[PDB]
Every structure is written in C-alpha cells, then in structure tokens.
Amino acid sequence: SGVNLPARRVIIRTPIFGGRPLDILTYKQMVGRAGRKGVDTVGESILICKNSEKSKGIALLQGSLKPVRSCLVTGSMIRAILEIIVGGVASTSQDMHTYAACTFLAASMGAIEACVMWLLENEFIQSTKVYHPTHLGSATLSSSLSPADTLDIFADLQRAMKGFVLENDLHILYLVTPMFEDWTTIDWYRFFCLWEKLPTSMKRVAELVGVEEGFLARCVKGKQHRQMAIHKRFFTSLVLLDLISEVPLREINQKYGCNRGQIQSLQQSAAVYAGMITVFSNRLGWHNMELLLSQFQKRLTFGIQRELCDLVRVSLLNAQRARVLYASGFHTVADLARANIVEVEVILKNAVPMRTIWVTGRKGLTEREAAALIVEEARMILQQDL
Amino acid sequence: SGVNLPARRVIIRTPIFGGRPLDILTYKQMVGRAGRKGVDTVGESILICKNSEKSKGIALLQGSLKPVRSCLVTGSMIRAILEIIVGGVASTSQDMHTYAACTFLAASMGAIEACVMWLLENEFIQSTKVYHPTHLGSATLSSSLSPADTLDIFADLQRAMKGFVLENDLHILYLVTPMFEDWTTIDWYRFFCLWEKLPTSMKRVAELVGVEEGFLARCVKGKQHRQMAIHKRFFTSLVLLDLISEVPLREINQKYGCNRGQIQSLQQSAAVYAGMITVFSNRLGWHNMELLLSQFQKRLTFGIQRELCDLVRVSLLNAQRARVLYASGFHTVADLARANIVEVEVILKNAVPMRTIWVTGRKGLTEREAAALIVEEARMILQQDL
Ligand SMILES: COc1ccccc1-c1ccncc1C(=O)Nc1nnc(OCc2ccc(Cl)cc2)s1
Ligand SMILES: COc1ccccc1-c1ccncc1C(=O)Nc1nnc(OCc2ccc(Cl)cc2)s1
C-alpha cells in the first residue's frame, strides 16, 4: 500500500498472511506492482500455494474487491455532528438531518438525534433547540481530536494543571503520549528494571499520573483496563523520554526491547498527539500548559533536545547532522546562514556512525552538497521569516 | 533625595521627622533646594522649631555630615567573596585577602576566611585549597541575588518544581513575589475576607506554598516568623494577581487597603525579583520554570495581561493606552506599525478615565502627537529588531 515500487516478478510466498487469508485489496495491491512500465513487456505475479492452501489461492486469483462502506451512536457520526454544529454550518435539528441526507449513508440507500443527545449530555454543545458550540466543543473541533477521547484528555490535562512536575520532561510527555495501541510488545521484566533505575524525580511523575510499583511490571511480571493503559503509557512515555534526550536508537532498542521502526512510528504518533494537545489547550485558555507543550511537537518530530530546536528547522538537520553541527558552536539558524561552507563540509565529514549522507526526500547527498544545502536552507529560513 | 526641584523658600515644618530627629544629610538635601539658579538672588530655608525642639533645630543648623563607612561574617563580605571567586578573578585565599586589601576597609585603616567557610559549607563553592564556583554558586552570581536569600530561593523553587499549579498565575507569582518588607500595612480582616472569596483553584496554590486557614488572617485577626512571611507573601501575591489581571488601581486600593503608590512600588519590586528568579533558573538548567517565568517580569513591569505583552514594548503604551488600543483590533506591534495614524488618534481620544495624555519621560503629550509617537515607536521596534 506504500510507495510505487514495481518489480518484474512479484512472488507472494503464502496466501495466508498473519494467520488470516490475504485480503483481496491487499493481493491486488501487491500484484499491481508486477511489471515495470516502459521496460518489461509483461509482468508476472506468482502466488505460491499448496494442498488445501490451493483453495484460498484460487479464491484470491478469481476474487474481486468488496464494495465500499460508510462506517457511519458511533464515533464517526458524533465527530461529524460536532464538526457541523461547532463550525456554525448547521444549527437546527432539521438541518442536522439534512446534513445526514448528504452523507454516503443517504447515497447507499434517529442516529443524529442520539449524537446530539450525546453532545448535549457531555457539555460539548449547548441548547437554546438551536445548538451552539461551547468552549469544550469548540476546543475539540479545533485540536482535531475525537470527542470520545477529548473527554478523558480534558480530565487528564485538568488534573495535570493542579499538580505538575517541572523538574523533568516526563510530565509534559505523559500528556502528549498518545496511547499504547500496539506500537510494541512491552516486556514486563525490562520495564520493572528500568523503573527500579529511574531518577529520584521520575517516580514522582509516575505516581502523580497514576503509575504504581505494586502494579508496575510486577503482578504482570509473574503473569484494570485503566491501570494497564497508564503503565503502558508510562513505559511509552519513558521511551519518548530517551528520544527527546537524543539517546541513539540502538541504545533505546537495547534498553527497551523495541526495534527502531516501532520507535520511529511511536515518536511520529507522539508528535502528532502533542500538536493536538497544544491546540486543545490553546483554544481552552490554558496559557500555562500550552506554553509548556509548544515545543514538544518539534522535540518529538526530530527526537532532539531544546538546544537544537532552532537548528532542526533546516530540512537537512534531523537529529544527528544538527548535534554534530551544534557541538562545533553553531547553536542557531543565524550562525548557520553564514556558517563557513567548507567548514560545515568538514564537520559533516567527521562523526560517522560518495553520496553517503542520506536526506529524506533528497535520497543520498554528498557531504559537500549536503552542507551547502544546509547553509542555503538556513539562509532562506532566516531571510524569509522576517 | 529625588529629582532636582528647586524652590525659592524651603520651609521644613518640624525638625522631628517620623518620630526621630531629621537626618543631617536629609536636612542638607532639603535646604539645598532653596534658591533657583538664574532666577532668584538668594535662597531661604526656614526650619520651624519651638520650645525644646529649638535645640534639635539649632543642632541641625550647626551640624555637619557624618563620615562615610564601609558596611563590610556579613552579607556584604559574603557577596563580595562570591563575586570575586565565581567570576574567576581570584582563586587562592592569598588572593582573597589581597582583594580585601583593596576594599574601603583597607583604606579606612579573618573575615574572608569566615566568608570562604560559609560559602564552602553552603555548596556555593568547591575546594580543590583553590576555590571554584559550583552550579549554585554560578547561578547566584548570575541572577544577582544575595547568597543569603538564594538558599531559601533555591529551596522554594525546587519545592515548586515537584508540585506546580498551572491553572492560574498565582504559583508563578508566589515565586516572583520578593517579600513583604513594609510595602503596606496588611489588614487581617480584609485579607481573610478576600481569602474567603478566592477561586476554587487559588487555595490550592495557597496550601501548596504554605498558607493556611487556621492562620490566614485568623489568629492575627483576633490579635511563626516563616508562616508570617508566607501569608504576607500570599497577600502580596494576591495583589500582584490583580495587577497582572489589569484591575484598576483604585479597585485594588479599595479591596486591599493599600494605596496606589505602595502598589506601584510593589509591582516594580516584584518585576525586578521576577527577572532575578528567571535568570537564576536559566543558569541552573531549569527549562520548565524559566519558560514559565520569562514573561512575568514584563507582566509585572506594566501590570498587563499576556495579550498586551507585545503592545507594551512601545514606550508609550503602559497598561491603559495598550488595552484601549488592543480592544480596537491591534493586538501586535506589527498591526500598530501601519496602524492608521488618525485612527489611533481617535482611539486614544476615546476611553478617558490639550496635552492630556501623560507619558513617562515625555511629560504631557497631545492625543495626536501621542499616538503618532506610538505608531512611530512600533515601526522602529519591528524594523530594528530583525
Ligand atoms: C490538531 O491539529 C494538529 C496540529 C498539529 C499536528 C497534528 C494535528 C492533527 C492531528 C490529528 N489529526 C488532525 C490534525 C490536524 O492537523 N488538524 C489541523 N487543523 N488545522 C490545521 O492547520 C491547517 C490550517 C490552518 C489555518 C488555515 Cl486558515 C487553514 C488550514 S492542522
Ligand atoms: C538578576 O538580574 C536582573 C535581571 C532583570 C531585572 C533585574 C535584575 C537585578 C535585580 C537586582 N539586582 C540586580 C539585578 C541585575 O540587573 N543584574 C544584572 N546582571 N546582568 C545584567 O545585564 C547587563 C549585561 C548583560 C550582558 C553584558 Cl555582555 C553586559 C551587561 S542585569
């Protein structure tokens, strides 16, 4: 389902993918890559099946795509009703049913009343029965979060304001940690070990958010839907703690047991969540929390420290071409606009963990061209932003 | 002792000033204003005395200024020793006594050893006996605070990081509140009344810093050196709360019983203290507290809200020419650089609580000239800062 990568022959080892038969859409997506346009005369797809498996293989061969659905009480319809009401585009319930008469459900061929009742009973919307957005209802639509999740997000942030720990970045990370989902398979023993070795200030954040020690890779070590979601959020917030501490990905993998792809996926998800939480607090008139969260989206997107938050504005300074360029004295995009060209070439030549330097979207770049583009990007950034 | 304000005749009602005889330096300062240069031929000072008072009056007439002193264990010598050691200008104790051989005490004609011992026993300085600044010793010299006060300041900030209240500005104000000193005569009943009417979130900050209700304008209402310094800091932090809430000075005076001169003096002192605390946290590697405190110095210097923190950068927008200029849509020094000249003239003409507008250092300014200078200052600010 990703990038366009055609191959002359596509061999699909087994029709059973992950314990379940291969999806017909997935199978079509795979076999559509068989054959390079303008190079090959034909393209070949070979699905390797056997014995009984032969039946599922022939079903995939002769199958066709399933019809499209709507997926619309439900979270999607709640989101849609909130989106229209809070935007001011629809006010009366007659308009509310008119809107549902414009959806895919109306084209495929009660719920809106239930959605309006749920939004009214949860203080997302006020009734005068003209429906008007509240402050929480406006903040949910602004920070782009599901109204189902926004209730617990509001409760968590409101509890965090009452007591906050400013001597580390872990409390500002537990709030921007999205969830556990399935980003990794948490090892309980490993978690408990890390916990037994946290600073004298972390466990303060751990107990201020809900984590424990009697249930913190303990009971589950030798073997509750919210406490599981807290510890699996604490561990997740510990990993991000090492991501914003510029710990190398291999060290994070060794200490936590999660591979680098999972760590990168988690950091991207956490940066998205941090941006959403920042907007949510900004629209709610929470100035003492939005100010704290305003930098963690960048610090999680690039996995950096605060010092590099100005250097990573350059498109070619991710988290290691900016740290080696920061240690040499360049700590600001201003010092990098006139940064001696050949100098940054030498600095990028040093510290190796022709076009060896790889840039996202630029593929491989030679050291000289890489740092030349770095200084040019710094010049553009500081020149067009004022 | 203030500005140069000469008068033809200076009449000093009584030689007894504030229950004590008038200082000879103060008397000379008063009577030096008798006579305007280039206008009067002579100047007259008349000290009105009587009966016994006549003796103190004639003593003031025939008195002379006392000799200068040095005022240098003592807090001044501790400050001087810390200043030289942490600056790196002096390292060995031989150099430390050489420094004291350069002071006014050496010119007027043990202590340095006691000061070094006090700085060593309080972790301001490390001994290798070459003396080197620590992180706390470097942070004390950076944020310009007395090392005597910096210990309790460090303890208070360190306690605040563990538990902080971000849902109001009162916790960020209790840390930047200098002290009680004598800025006002606190009325206990009034204080207790205000306290009985605080938001459901203030008393959280009050109990997180040390304030109580059993002793909060209670016992002292019907009638301990630290609890007195906390409540007298809580009340002081409440007043500043109304100063940064843009409450009019007369309303603050009515609700708190402190006149406007005392309130302005307190707000200036608190802004100075906020700047010092911000630098102290900046040099200690406290990024989650320096970020919170980075705006309160301005918000206390001008007694404004956050929205006006960009408008008050203009020299002629204190806290009421910026609020009336903010309500009309100008919320940034960018919108005020091209702000229609005649438009801001009309806006300044409105909202009155020829040169009626008074500007600090510009004396009285006509509305047209005032807002013309306002837009010119905005242009200069946004033009020379990038
Ligand atoms: C909550 O918003 C986020 C902020 C940071 C990072 C991720 C998200 C996010 C996360 C999950 N799902 C969605 C979003 C999302 O992008 N929502 C957005 N809403 N507005 C945006 O700006 C676009 C824009 C701005 C101004 C104008 Cl005039 C027109 C368009 S982005
Ligand atoms: C703690 O510093 C404060 C900061 C804000 C407001 C009040 C104070 C304060 C309060 C009580 N006593 C003293 C101060 C004071 O100004 N100390 C200062 N130290 N350095 C400064 O900047 C001058 C400077 C800067 C850079 C160079 Cl290269 C040369 C000189 S000011």
DSSP state string for A111-124: HHHHHHHHHHHTTS
Dmax over CA atoms of chain A, in Å, equals 69
Q: How far apart are CA B299 and CA B312, in angstroms?
A: 9
Closest CA to A176 of A237, A130, A106: A237
CB within 8 Å of B161: residues ≥ 6 apart: A165, A166, A167, B286, B288, B289
Sign of CA pseudo-dihedral A334, A337, A342, A348: positive
SS (H, E, C) chain B: CCCCCCECEEEECCCEECCEECCHHHHHHHHCCECCCCCCCCCEEEECCCCCHHHHHHHHHHCCCCCCCCCCCCHHHHHHHHHHHHCCCCCCHHHHHHHHCCCHHHHHCCHHHHHHHHHHHCCCEEECCCEEECHHHHHHHHCCCCHHHHHHHHHHHHHHHHCECCCCCCHHHHCCCCCCCCCCCCCHHHHHHHHHCCCCCHHHHHHHHCCCCCCCCCCCCCCCCCHHHHHHHHHHHHHHHHHHCCCCHHHHHHHHCCCHHHHHHHHHHHHHHHHHHHHHHHHCCCHHHHHHHCCHHHHHHCCCCHHHHCCCCCCCCCCCCCHHHHCCCCCCHHHHHCCCHHHHHHHHHCCCCCCCEEECCCEEECHHHHHHHHHHHHHHHHHHCC
Sort strands A44-47 and A357-359 into parallel, antiparallel or unpaired: unpaired
Half-sphere exposure of B166 (CA within 13 A, CB side): 28
Dmax over CA atoms of chain B, in Å, equals 69
Cα-based angle B295, B298, B299 (whole degrees, multiple of 5): 80
Full DSSP string of A130-186: -EEE-HHHHHHHHTT--HHHHHHHHHHHHHHHHSB--SSSSHHHHTT----TTSS--
Q: Residues A195, A170: contact at Cβ < 8 Å?
A: no
Q: How far apart are CA B48 and CA A43, in angstroms?
A: 115
Sign of CA pseudo-dihedral A208, A213, A214, A219: positive
| Contact (CB<8Å) A165/B160 | no
Q: Residues A132, A92: contact at Cβ < 8 Å?
A: no
Please, is B121 exposed, middle or buried when counting C-beta atoms within 10 Å of its C-beta (0-12, 13-18, 19+)?
A: exposed
| Contact (CB<8Å) B162/A160 | no
Which of A162, A201, A306 has its CB closest to that of B167?
A162
Q: How far apart are CA B251 and CA B257, in angstroms?
A: 10
Closest CA to B374 of B312, B288, B328, B319: B312
Q: How far apart are CA A363 and CA A354, in angstroms?
A: 13
For chain A positions 102-161, those within 8 Å of chain B (CB to CB) are 158, 160-161
Question: B291 is written with which tokens?
Answer: 């970020």
Q: Residues A305, A244: contact at Cβ < 8 Å?
A: yes
Please tell me if residue B174 touches chain A, with a CB cutoff of 8 Å: no
Contacts of B164 in chain A (CB under 8 A): 163-166
For residue B144, the CA-to-ligand 2 centroid distance in Å is: 7
Bridge partners for B357 per DSSP: B365
CB within 8 Å of A236: residues ≥ 6 apart: A177, A179, A180, A183, A266, A270
Tell me the CA distances in angstroms from A181 to A186, A303, B83, one per residue in order.
Answer: 11, 20, 55
CB atoms within 10 A of CB B115: 26
Q: How far apart are CA B153 and CA B274, in angstroms?
A: 12
For chain A positions 312-331, those within 8 Å of chain B (CB to CB) are none
Whose tokens are 């617990």? That residue is: A152
Q: Residues B292, A291: contact at Cβ < 8 Å?
A: yes
Q: How far apart are CA A194 and CA A186, in angstroms?
A: 12
Q: Is A147 in the pocket of ligand 1 (CB under 6 A)?
A: no
CA A223 from centre of chain: 30
Mutating to test ligand 1, I would choose from A141, A150, A272 the residue with most ligand atoms within 8 A of its C-beta, which is: A272
User: Which structural technique was applied?
Assistant: cryo-EM
For residue B271, the CA-to-ligand 2 centroid distance in Å is: 12
Q: Is B178 in the pocket of ligand 2 (CB under 6 A)?
A: no
b (16+ CB within 10 A) / e for A243-275: bbebeebeebbebbebeeebbeebbebbbbbbb
Helix (H, G, I), strand (E, B) or coil at A12: strand
Helix (H, G, I), strand (E, B) or coil at A77: helix
**What resolution (Å)?**
3.2
For residue B257, give the amino acid letter: G
CB within 8 Å of B72: residues ≥ 6 apart: B80, B103, B104, B105, B111
Please tell me if residue A304 touches chain B, with a CB cutoff of 8 Å: no
Helical pair A188-196 and A249-256, crossing angle rounded to 10 deg: 110
Q: After which residues is chain A broken (C to N over 2.5 A)?
A: 72, 109, 128, 223, 353
Question: B52 is written with which tokens?
Answer: 């016994």
Q: Is B272 in the pocket of ligand 2 (CB under 6 A)?
A: yes
Show contacts of A253-261: CB within 8 Å, 24+ apart. A255/A190, A255/A194, A256/A184, A256/A187, A256/A190, A256/A194, A257/A184, A257/A185, A257/A187, A257/A190, A258/A183, A258/A184, A258/A185
